[PDB]
Every structure is written in C-alpha cells, then in structure tokens.
Design a protein around this ligand. Structure first.
Ligand code: HEM
Length: 293
C-alpha cells in the first residue's frame, strides 16, 4: 500500500567513511565564513536538511529524506525552497569528493554537521538512504506557510507524525540564520547569536516586546525594538497554551531543549525509512574540535 523504503548501506562503507564526509563539510563550514554577512552556511544547511525531510506524508509514505529528490528540478525549484540552492552549491564539491554517498545521506548529514559544528547537541545519524528516480519526486506545496496560527502548525506537523513537544523543539532551530526578503518575503534574524545553537529563540519569544508590522513584501511579521523578528507561525507558539508551556520550559532549560531537539531532528530525518535489524546503529560523529582538526 504505502511505499516501503528500506535503508541500504552504501556498499562497503563504515563509520570512518562517513566521519570523513562530516569532516569535509565541517572544514568547508569553517573556511567559507563570509556567507550571508559572516553568518556562515551552517543555518542554510540546517534548513536544507529540514526541507528535504519535510515533504514526507505519513499517509502513503511518499516524500521524506530517503530519495534525495531535492536533486530533481521539480523539488529544487519549489518556491518554498527558495534560497536552498546555496546549501546545494556548498555541498556539490563535497559530493564530487565522496561520490559513493547517496544524496539523501549527504543532504541530511549536512544538517547534522551544521548543528554540531554550531555547538548544538550531538544528533545520532543513520546512513542507508538510496537515490530514487526522478518520478518519486514529491509535488510542491508540502512545506508549511509562515503566515498561519498554532492550529495550522499542529495540523501540519501531524502529517510528519510530530506532537506538540516535537514541534516546539524543532522550531527552536529558528535561533539560526535569518529571513531574507528575496527568499521568503520576510526580513530579519530571530536573535543575536545566529550561528551558535542555543535556546535564544525561546528567550526572545518570551522577553521581547513584539510589534505586529507589515514588511516591504507586504507580509506581517512581529518586530522587536532589538531588531529581531518572529514569523506568525513562530509567534503562534505563545498564543497556544499547550505550546507556550513548552516554550517556557525551553527558555528555562537549554539542556532539556537540546535533548528534545536531538530526538526530534533525528526522527524528522528518518521519517519514512525502514531500518532492517542488521543495519548499523546510528552513528555519532565527532566534531572537528573533538578530533583536534
Ligand atoms: C512552521 C514551520 C516553519 C516555517 C513556516 C518556517 C519558515 C521559514 C522561513 C519563511 C524561513 C526564511 C527563509 C529565507 O528567507 O531565507 C526559514 C528559515 C529557516 N528555517 Fe524555518 N520554518 C519552519 C520550521 C523550521 C524547522 C522545523 C527548522 C529546522 C528544524 C527550520 C530551520 C530554519 C533555519 C535554520 C532557517 C534559517 C536559514 C537561513 O538563514 O538561510 N525551520 N524558515
């Protein structure tokens, strides 16, 4: 009924092989530091890994990270994917160096690497995604809109099998990077330390004096006098009572948030994938710093 996507390890590669891909991504992150006014590519990589995974539909098992479909024009040109071509171009040179890794494995590993190199938590990662044909490419319109409320958010995330806790944990990724008018019709960062992974998102949410205003794209965003912004969907996290108590927990405990994020992020990246019992356990990569590199 539902497609079945069995993870298949890239023939004859082990942990050490993947650690080398990780280290290559990481060294390039370190080196190409001028991107987006010195934010670096970390944030776009995280967003890339979420977008390739977010097309999943728990109803017929289509979409998700498995197929590396983002490589196809249809998904690549998804209006909701605007600005991701930058993460793509960053990974190409890497793919050329390690041509045996599948796309889905590379795209998703980029996300893990960025998080960990940006001082976030360790995210267990599993290999085995297999490139699928251009015809398995999901139609556009499965990624969420930003101009909605808590109800939309809850409903949406339900398609990916995420509960309230998972939704709020994952959204704390908004501490990274920023909106770009040209990409999404939103402009501004969510906080100050946008290339370091912290619970800043939650603090800003609770602590700033947010003003609803329209931007130059003629969209409404919540603006703070500190120069930060929140999307309607971000804001909705404090409008819903269930959401708001989680936000509070995270604002209060960065550890808690890190643990929750880690689980939800991995889950997000593994949705739609069946792992045979003989499959290797999830890998935990060392950072550059842990390797002395
Ligand atoms: C309701 C769900 C979400 C909505 C509506 C949303 C919307 C957006 C929008 C409109 C942008 C700005 C794009 C641009 O103009 O460059 C953005 C950026 C970003 N999103 Fe989200 N997002 C959502 C969930 C997530 C999740 C679950 C993650 C990761 C777990 C994530 C990670 C990021 C990151 C890191 C950026 C910054 C990228 C950069 O600086 O290029 N977002 N998101």
């Amino acid at each position: 009924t539902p497609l079945v996507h069995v993870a298949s390890v890239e023939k004859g590669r082990s942990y050490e092989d993947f650690q080398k891909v990780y280290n290559a991504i990481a060294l390039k992150l370190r080196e190409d530091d001028e991107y987006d006014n010195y934010i670096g590519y970390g944030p776009v990589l995280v967003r890339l890994a979420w977008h390739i995974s977010g097309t999943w539909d728990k109803h017929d098992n289509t979409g998700g990270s498995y197929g590396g479909t983002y490589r196809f024009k249809k998904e690549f040109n998804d209006p909701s994917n605007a600005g991701l071509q930058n993460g793509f171009k960053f990974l190409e040179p890497i793919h050329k160096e390690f041509p045996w890794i599948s796309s889905g494995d590379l795209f998703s590993l980029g996300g893990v690497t960025a998080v960990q190199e940006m001082q976030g938590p360790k995210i267990p990662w599993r290999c085995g995604r297999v490139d699928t044909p251009e015809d398995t490419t999901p139609d556009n319109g499965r990624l969420p809109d930003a101009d909605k409320d808590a109800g939309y958010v809850r409903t949406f995330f339900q398609r990916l099998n995420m509960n309230d806790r998972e939704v709020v944990a994952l959204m704390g990724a908004h501490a990274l990077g920023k909106t770009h008018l040209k990409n999404s019709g939103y402009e501004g960062p969510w906080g100050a330390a946008n290339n370091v992974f912290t619970n800043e998102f939650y603090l800003n949410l609770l602590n700033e004096d947010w003003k609803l205003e329209k931007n130059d794209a003629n969209n409404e965003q919540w603006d703070s006098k500190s120069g930060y912004m929140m999307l309607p969907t971000d804001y909705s996290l404090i409008q819903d009572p269930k959401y708001l108590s989680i936000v509070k927990e995270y604002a209060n405990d960065q550890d808690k948030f890190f643990k929750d994020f880690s689980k939800a992020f991995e889950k997000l990246l593994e949705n739609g994938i069946t792992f045979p019992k003989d499959a290797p356990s999830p890998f935990i990569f060392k950072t550059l710093e842990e390797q002395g590199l």
